[PDB]
Amino acid sequence: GSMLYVSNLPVGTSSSAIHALFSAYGNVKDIWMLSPDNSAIVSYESLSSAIVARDALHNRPVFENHGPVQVMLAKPS
Amino acid sequence: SGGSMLYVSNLPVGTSSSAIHALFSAYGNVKDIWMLSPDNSAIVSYESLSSAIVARDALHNRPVFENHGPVQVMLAKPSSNYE
């Protein structure tokens, strides 16, 4: 699989909202939210999905009233 | 599925994943490590919540590396699973 760290979300963003956003690019297996819900760890089934989602969403303001979201690839070891 | 995630930030520049395992293995069985290079951050997983809490308490806001300011460790909430 692959994994992403997503930050600069609006405070209070729901895991459901993250799932909907990231499900367009792959099969989301798990989401961990970080308090106060302005960042999240997103796990995908396929290696390719994190790369495609990052290309789609990184540095874009996908939420109203808020700046661009940051999407970082989590490099496994 | 399941398990606890720590988001670790303000690592010294050039900190490797092997160094991170060494540091976090003091508090339990590290399950996985991901590096957020080129940023000085990482993600550390433990299967046990109590290991993650103890690690977070021991390391958050602690200058654990020489000649470097305090490392940050944030425990994520329990995950949602979609499988």
From Swiss-Prot, chain B:
Residue ranges of every copy of the RRM domain listed in the record: 5-78
Membrane spanning residue stretches: none
Subcellular location as annotated: Cytoplasm
Domain of life according to the entry: Eukaryota
Protein name: Pumilio domain-containing protein C56F2.08c
Taxonomic source organism: Schizosaccharomyces pombe (strain 972 / ATCC 24843)
Full protein: residues contained: 1 to 79 of 661
